[PDB]
Motif scaffolding. Structure first.
Motif, mmCIF file in Angstrom:
data_model
loop_
_atom_site.group_PDB
_atom_site.id
_atom_site.type_symbol
_atom_site.label_atom_id
_atom_site.label_comp_id
_atom_site.label_asym_id
_atom_site.label_seq_id
_atom_site.Cartn_x
_atom_site.Cartn_y
_atom_site.Cartn_z
ATOM 1 N N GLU A 82 42.283 43.608 40.594
ATOM 2 C CA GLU A 82 42.478 42.224 41.010
ATOM 3 C C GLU A 82 43.673 41.583 40.325
ATOM 4 O OE1 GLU A 82 38.499 40.609 40.098
ATOM 5 O OE2 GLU A 82 38.093 40.829 42.251
ATOM 6 N N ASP A 83 44.860 42.108 40.604
ATOM 7 C CA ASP A 83 46.076 41.577 40.005
ATOM 8 C C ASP A 83 46.844 40.713 41.005
ATOM 9 O OD1 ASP A 83 48.641 41.221 38.755
ATOM 10 O OD2 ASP A 83 48.140 42.940 37.479
ATOM 11 N N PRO A 84 46.768 39.379 40.848
ATOM 12 C CA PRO A 84 47.434 38.397 41.712
ATOM 13 C C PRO A 84 48.925 38.655 41.909
ATOM 14 C CG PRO A 84 45.885 37.313 40.294
ATOM 15 C CD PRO A 84 46.067 38.701 39.744
ATOM 16 N N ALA A 85 49.583 39.191 40.883
ATOM 17 C CA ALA A 85 51.013 39.478 40.971
ATOM 18 C C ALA A 85 51.320 40.653 41.900
ATOM 19 C CB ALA A 85 51.575 39.758 39.580
ATOM 20 N N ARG A 86 50.329 41.508 42.132
ATOM 21 C CA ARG A 86 50.512 42.676 42.987
ATOM 22 C C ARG A 86 49.642 42.679 44.236
ATOM 23 N NH1 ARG A 86 53.446 46.384 42.116
ATOM 24 N NH2 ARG A 86 54.451 47.132 40.194
ATOM 25 N N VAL A 87 48.612 41.841 44.259
ATOM 26 C CA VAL A 87 47.718 41.807 45.406
ATOM 27 C C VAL A 87 47.258 40.400 45.795
ATOM 28 C CG1 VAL A 87 45.767 42.273 43.886
ATOM 29 C CG2 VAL A 87 45.515 42.632 46.319
HETATM 30 ZN ZN LIG Z 1 50.452 43.512 37.639
#
Ligand SMILES: [Zn+2]
Ligand SMILES: [Zn+2]
Lengths: 226, 226
Positions: free
Chosen positions: A210-215
């Motif tokens: 759950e990485d906002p910067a990637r997803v």
């Molecule tokens: Zn990331």
């Protein structure tokens, strides 16, 4: 999972009151961003503090002249945190790669620092077009590849061999490629994501946690997944 | 009746080759104008002699901020003979008349004298909105009222109690109002015009004969017309 959400209210008949209510709801939910058509950026700006202001550009056709596209993105970058711009769909289908890359590099470059997501409109693409396009998007230095506008036509999409809604397989395909090429690009899926179940499936499919910067998860019904 | 036709090929996935083919077909048929998304304006410009070059603006949502809409129309007027710009639908639904008129008066005036058609998107309007919108369109100095984009949503249309396809009843209603208010405005019905009889039905309902400066028939199937 709510923090990976880009709460989108993009119908042309959306009213000011509805747009305002959406922003207020975006803040309370703690979503990653609130996406609206440019016209409502100024009125919504004051209501957003923690959540990012996201606006669409040359949406949903991506059929504006490159010159108008860079100009639009430039203005938009003055108030929006993030910009989701449609790829030159017509030129992609025309296989005019030289023009497609000229457009995307110039358009992304016009966002001057803002987070830029290029909408590939997966429903309309064939494999020979999608990977060349992903390469161009990375070349342009965009931050995300957004799978679709949410307004793709089922008929034409089917003819191109694709479903109109987001699927875990497509999400994985994009994520696998980025990872393998080593591109600094995130994956934002949009279209048909209205249940916490489907959303979860897409997150597991992408495989980046759950990485906002990637997803990111694009949806008009955020409450449904948290 | 073909000379009242506005042959439109606006799908975002339309290719360059398809747009070229369309222009050639437009010239052969002798239609009033050929409408395409601005990206293809330059490549089509040379194939159009008798037929006018028509391009849509901020299409099909009409959801860009006014400044961008002005800039866009200004740029488009440099290469297009006619410009079909979408009304600020969201603002109309919001009954934000002060903003709607500030927008349309500015946008139409940015056309620099080119023939401007303001798309009303009749499928999404109620009587409490359309007539005031027509007043504004006239006040703005537009040449035509274009009934719809051709991309109106069936669900929302039904919600508003309107059919998506063009009807003689609607055409007659628009014509009657402009006649009664003495507005110098033409009527362009577009969307769902598939046959010669339907086209004739509309022309008779408008009651202005086959006058191109005041009546147009927008369709993607011009051959069927004649
Ligand atoms: Zn990331
Ligand atoms: Zn006349």
């Amino acid at each position: 999972m709510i923090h990976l959400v880009d709460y989108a209210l993009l119908k042309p008949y959306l009213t000011v009151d509805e747009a305002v209510a959406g922003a207020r709801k975006a803040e309370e939910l703690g979503v990653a961003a609130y996406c609206v058509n440019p016209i409502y950026a100024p009125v919504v700006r004051p209501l957003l503090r923690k959540v990012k202001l996201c606006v669409v550009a040359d949406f949903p056709f991506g059929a504006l002249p490159t010159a108008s596209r860079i100009a639009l993105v430039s203005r938009l970058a003055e108030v929006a945190d993030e910009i989701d711009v449609v790829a030159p769909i017509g030129l992609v289908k025309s296989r005019r790669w030289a023009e497609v890359r000229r457009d995307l590099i110039s358009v992304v470059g016009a966002a001057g620092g803002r987070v830029v997501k290029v909408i590939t409109e997966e429903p309309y693409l064939r494999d020979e077009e999608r990977y060349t396009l992903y390469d161009i998007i990375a070349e342009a230095g965009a931050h995300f590849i957004k799978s679709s506008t949410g307004f793709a036509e089922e008929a034409y999409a089917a003819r191109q061999g694709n479903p109109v809604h987001s699927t875990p397989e497509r999400a994985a395909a994009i994520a696998r490629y980025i990872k393998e090429k080593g591109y600094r690009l995130g994956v934002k899926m949009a279209g048909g994501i209205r249940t916490r179940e489907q959303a979860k499936a897409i997150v597991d499919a992408i495989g980046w946690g759950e990485d906002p910067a990637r997803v990111r998860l694009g949806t008009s019904t955020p409450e449904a997944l948290l």
